[PDB]
Amino acid sequence: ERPTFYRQELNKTIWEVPERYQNLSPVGSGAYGSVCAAFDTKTGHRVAVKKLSRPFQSIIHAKRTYRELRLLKHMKHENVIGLLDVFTPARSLEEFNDVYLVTHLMGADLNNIVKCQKLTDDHVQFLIYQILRGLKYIHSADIIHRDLKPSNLAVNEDCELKILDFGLVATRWYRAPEIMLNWMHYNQTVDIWSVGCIMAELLTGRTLFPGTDHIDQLKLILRLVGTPGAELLKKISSESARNYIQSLAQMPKMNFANVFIGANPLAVDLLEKMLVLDSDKRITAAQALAHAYFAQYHDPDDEPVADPYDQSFESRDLLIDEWKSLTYDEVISFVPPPL
Ligand SMILES: Cc1ccc(C(=O)N[C@@H](CCC2CCCCC2)C(N)=O)cc1NC(=O)c1cnn(-c2ccccc2)c1C(F)(F)F
């Protein structure tokens, strides 16, 4: 029983959606699609509807479309955005040319919230706990976010948090030195670097490392954490990067307690464990949840891992119509979650 659809124009964009979804109004537009808020007549809840921009125009657009649907269909966790619905007005593979994605509608993001003023220590404990609980889940499936920043963390009035990616404040301000500079092997803990930058900003009300470019960014980071020692220099394979590092005048590591003055000492200790250059030594999400800073919230019996995720498609080079047929299969096979 294919539902009945209706059509309108919003900010120069045409939208065709089932009658289930009423009173659409624009929230935001980005590189890869635009979002509206809607009322879901079947649940009586507000939702977000994303219409992908030219989803099958090139091989790269088609693979990105497939990737976003595969990731959204996987996510079943309280602190990660989830898929409530996916539809197309198309009746056949042949007509298939538009993809719409439906999630919960959140109240605000942490960019909005910190721009107002800095947060209390109790609010920081609860927000960073929920981020790490979400990251333990996605990291357990070998999924890396890679673009964490305050605008990708969405909250309701009761402070319940979900990690999302809107797909665009500079990304470089939150990016791990090893992935920004390609200077060492990189794992899930690029995301723990971003969390440390975000937690500092929620506590102080100030961007920790507001670099103008990749060179200025590295200079601001090294002023806090210190120039690499001989033991970390051993692990850098890029001769360009090592030459550049060793061509700078040495800087000592600062005492974080002398930078974040009058913060909770357990908050300062956790920032010292997150903002380390050596990606082998940086704290994991699972280890961070057991840290004393989270004593009020930590429950080792309610921090679940994910089902395994098949990311073998990431290594494939296919034609537009192949990525399009794969995406069609995932729309057809979608099972909605419990009401
Ligand atoms: C409809 C929709 C569709 C797709 C996504 C989305 O996160 N896609 C990701 C998926 C994969 C990610 C992997 C790493 C972990 C996180 C997921 C992507 N880019 O591929 C989000 C929304 N929803 C929203 O994006 C949404 C839901 N409230 N709000 C919202 C936020 C703040 C204030 C008001 C509304 C928004 C928005 F950002 F637009 F404004």
Swiss-Prot record:
Documented effect of changing A31V: Lowered kinase activity
Tissue specificity note: Brain, heart, placenta, pancreas and skeletal muscle. Expressed to a lesser extent in lung, liver and kidney.
Modified residues (Phosphotyrosine): Y309
Modified residues (Phosphothreonine): T13, A249
Active site residues per record: D165
Regulation of activity: Activated by cell stresses such as DNA damage, heat shock, osmotic shock, anisomycin and sodium arsenite, as well as pro-inflammatory stimuli such as bacterial lipopolysaccharide (LPS) and interleukin-1.
This protein's UniProt keywords: Acetylation, Apoptosis, ATP-binding, Cytoplasm, Kinase, Nucleotide-binding, Nucleus, Phosphoprotein, Serine/threonine-protein kinase, Stress response, Transcription, Transcription regulation, Transferase, Ubl conjugation
GO cellular component: cytoplasm; cytosol; extracellular region; ficolin-1-rich granule lumen; glutamatergic synapse; mitochondrion; nuclear speck; nucleoplasm
PTM (free text): Dual phosphorylation can also be mediated by TAB1-mediated autophosphorylation. TCR engagement in T-cells also leads to Tyr-309 phosphorylation by ZAP70. Dephosphorylated and inactivated by DUPS1, DUSP10 and DUSP16. PPM1D also mediates dephosphorylation and inactivation of MAPK14.
Gene Ontology BP annotations: 3'-UTR-mediated mRNA stabilization; angiogenesis; apoptotic process; bone development; cartilage condensation; cell morphogenesis; cell surface receptor protein serine/threonine kinase signaling pathway; cell surface receptor signaling pathway
The enzyme's E.C. designation: 2.7.11.24
Modified residues (N6-acetyllysine): K50, K149
Annotated phenotype, changing F313L: Emulation of the active state. Increase in activity
Known cofactor(s): Mg(2+)
Any GO molecular function: protein serine kinase activity
The protein's assembly and partners: Component of a signaling complex containing at least AKAP13, PKN1, MAPK14, ZAK and MAP2K3. Within this complex, AKAP13 interacts directly with PKN1, which in turn recruits MAPK14, MAP2K3 and ZAK. Binds to a kinase interaction motif within the protein tyrosine phosphatase, PTPRR. This interaction retains MAPK14 in the cytoplasm and prevents nuclear accumulation. Interacts with SPAG9 and GADD45A. Interacts with CDC25B, CDC25C, DUSP1, DUSP10, DUSP16, NP60, SUPT20H and TAB1. Interacts with casein kinase II subunits CSNK2A1 and CSNK2B. Interacts with PPM1D.
Entry function: Serine/threonine kinase which acts as an essential component of the MAP kinase signal transduction pathway. MAPK14 is one of the four p38 MAPKs which play an important role in the cascades of cellular responses evoked by extracellular stimuli such as pro-inflammatory cytokines or physical stress leading to direct activation of transcription factors. Accordingly, p38 MAPKs phosphorylate a broad range of proteins and it has been estimated that they may have approximately 200 to 300 substrates each. (Microbial infection) Activated by phosphorylation by M.tuberculosis EsxA in T-cells leading to inhibition of IFN-gamma production; phosphorylation is apparent within 15 minutes and is inhibited by kinase-specific inhibitors SB203580 and siRNA.
Domain statement: The TXY motif contains the threonine and tyrosine residues whose phosphorylation activates the MAP kinases.
Protein known as: Mitogen-activated protein kinase 14
Origin species: Homo sapiens
